[PDB]
Design a protein around this ligand. Sequence first.
Ligand SMILES: Cc1c(C(=O)Nc2ccccc2CC(=O)O)sc2nc[nH]c(=O)c12
Ligand SMILES: Cc1c(C(=O)Nc2ccccc2CC(=O)O)sc2nc[nH]c(=O)c12
Ligand SMILES: *Cc1c(COP(=O)(O)O)cnc(C)c1O
Ligand SMILES: *Cc1c(COP(=O)(O)O)cnc(C)c1O
Ligand SMILES: [Cl-]
Ligand SMILES: [Cl-]
Ligand SMILES: [Cl-]
Ligand SMILES: [Cl-]
Lengths: 363, 359
Amino acid sequence: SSFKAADLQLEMTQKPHKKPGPGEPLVFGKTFTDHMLMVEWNDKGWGQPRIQPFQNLTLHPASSSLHYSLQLFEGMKAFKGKDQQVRLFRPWLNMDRMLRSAMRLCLPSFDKLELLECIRRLIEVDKDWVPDAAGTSLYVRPVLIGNEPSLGVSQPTRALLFVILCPVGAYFPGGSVTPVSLLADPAFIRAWVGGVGNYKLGGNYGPTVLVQQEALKRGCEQVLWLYGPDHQLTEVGTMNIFVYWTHEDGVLELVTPPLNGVILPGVVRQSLLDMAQTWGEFRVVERTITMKQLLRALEEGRVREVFGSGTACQVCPVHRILYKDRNLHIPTMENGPELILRFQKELKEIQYGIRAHEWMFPV
Amino acid sequence: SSFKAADLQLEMTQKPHKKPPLVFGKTFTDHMLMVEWNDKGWGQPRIQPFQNLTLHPASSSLHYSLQLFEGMKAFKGKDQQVRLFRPWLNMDRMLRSAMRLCLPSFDKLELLECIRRLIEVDKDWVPDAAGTSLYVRPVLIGNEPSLGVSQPTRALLFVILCPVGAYFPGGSVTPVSLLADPAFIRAWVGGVGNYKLGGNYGPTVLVQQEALKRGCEQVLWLYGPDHQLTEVGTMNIFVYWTHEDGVLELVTPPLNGVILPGVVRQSLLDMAQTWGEFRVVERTITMKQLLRALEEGRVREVFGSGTACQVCPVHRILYKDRNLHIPTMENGPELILRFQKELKEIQYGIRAHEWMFPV
Ligand SMILES: Cc1c(C(=O)Nc2ccccc2CC(=O)O)sc2nc[nH]c(=O)c12
Ligand SMILES: Cc1c(C(=O)Nc2ccccc2CC(=O)O)sc2nc[nH]c(=O)c12
Ligand SMILES: *Cc1c(COP(=O)(O)O)cnc(C)c1O
Ligand SMILES: *Cc1c(COP(=O)(O)O)cnc(C)c1O
Ligand SMILES: [Cl-]
Ligand SMILES: [Cl-]
Ligand SMILES: [Cl-]
Ligand SMILES: [Cl-]
């Protein structure tokens, strides 16, 4: 059985460090809060969870986390409203995803609600680290790793679950959408049907570093991940992809690829579908999108906006795709971008507690 | 640039562990190699007592799988002399893996010499009973304390050693049965299956469990709509058969992106080519080709190759819920035994060979 929040052990720090100031620009992900969550698993089950001072991990050099990538992570944001209340965005969905990732790598199960409560308690302890300036947030990074001291390629009998926290400044410095250019080269494949691209596993990210460098060398900012003989658009970098257009049947539509194995089921992605479906103003579908369809829609002036979704920026416009040595101008910014702006506005209102919503989990 | 073996620092253990049954991969020797890389380049390499790693919780090795490894064996002959099998090839492969993950390059011969010195320090750990060896596990990991999905500015290269028992205890070769289900995919063209990266292995644990549930020891990894045979577990696959053109041949899949280029694999090709007794070819092999050849009695032996076992016969493949009998063992298995014997004689120093690197 799972670790329990009722069993939480707490150790407050004695060497708190300076919090970064809002005036200094932060590169993402290098500054951490004072405490962390740690829980250890062995064949007899989970130990008691603990909130402890941020500190190093001590791992056996044969730890399967480091040899066979028995590792997975999550990523979600907590937001502090003007009322000073801290709230997590739809964290239940992150817990569901984390558990699915754990089962895929034969890592131990845990109770999703017990972990969520332990994370709440951690953020509570480090509440002062949650910034409240516009467009700022606290990024929460749960990790589960195998930790068997053995070179056998096997299900581990030991594991570690920890959570660390990282305050974040504004993704769009200035407070306004900045479009990105994408390299679409079918030679690079992020994930395959039957593979593990639909789980947030460490192994899906390391191989992308070189491909992202290649995008930069070709004058693009991010990678448009193509899949199959028909060059399906799957994801943009570490963002889910959305296209807002009049479809071939003449109907105004928001489409994003379906969860058929090569798509990471984004929490923001699900939220944009939920939100747009609720409005009931245009068709909202999950369907494959091909480069042939995009090329045709662009030539016929049917595309309004293309954008990525994710925790990192919420919604990110795309203005250009480099495909088969040709630049495709995507007219997103010449169309408002109305839908992008609307999503950003309504997400912000929910996230910073301007309007109450069941999507927000209060800390 | 590179760390230099000339700068190697040695610190001997003050708490030596009692030496050695042996389940693979759980027993380690007294010392390890460690080298750190940061913005000032590579530090000096050190041999230190076996000990835990201390890693920042944001270390990119644990979040984005910036990790790769190697595996090679040292063997102790009757002359008590220890020798590594074709280690230059492992160094070449390690460097290819490092470049693929944007990890720092190093000089292959400098690493090789540091590894030689490590094994030398722990030489009494190398067993000398029949079929036994010392397994050498170099690892290179990213070590940036950042959640950015980026090329690291810090890294760690370490090497640990395991004594290993006989793969076929008692000497008799025993075949493996395979589950062949196209639902499972190990790697894809445009992926990273041809590098020895940690990320390729974690995902196979659940698949292997499913094979065992279906009463099979290992996974036959199929690829493409034509069900190309790619690998057997973590072994390269060979088929010894009379081909459709009437010619007796040894075939293994080509290095087209989904095949990890094994050192033993390359060695079997080299050895068979040297014999000049039958055709040796790298060619795609499909399940339909295999089924036809089996129906027509053209298959002699099917086997996997790898550092773990050198060679391992296959006698059964479960495909589309049907058991395919592979007549490997009924055929000796003559070729498998021949490869096994020659490799053994080379590895334990019974016959001189440039493939062996003395420690
Ligand atoms: C969260 C985040 C970044 C990131 O790399 N995230 C990430 C990491 C691994 C896999 C997927 C993702 C995608 C995701 O968080 O949406 S870069 C970044 N820049 C500014 N502000 C942010 O909040 C931020
Ligand atoms: C080396 C080894 C094993 C292993 O799992 N190795 C391995 C690990 C990760 C990727 C590929 C491989 C394949 C390879 O070493 O040939 S299991 C095993 N059992 C008995 N004796 C051994 O020497 C042995
Ligand atoms: C994390 C991630 C996303 C976005 O998921 P959110 O839950 O919306 O932050 C999209 N694609 C990939 C490949 C990812 O790793
Ligand atoms: C390590 C490995 C092999 C065998 O390589 P050798 O260098 O012969 O030990 C084969 N296939 C895969 C997938 C591997 O990881
Ligand atoms: Cl899914
Ligand atoms: Cl060689
Ligand atoms: Cl190759
Ligand atoms: Cl062996």
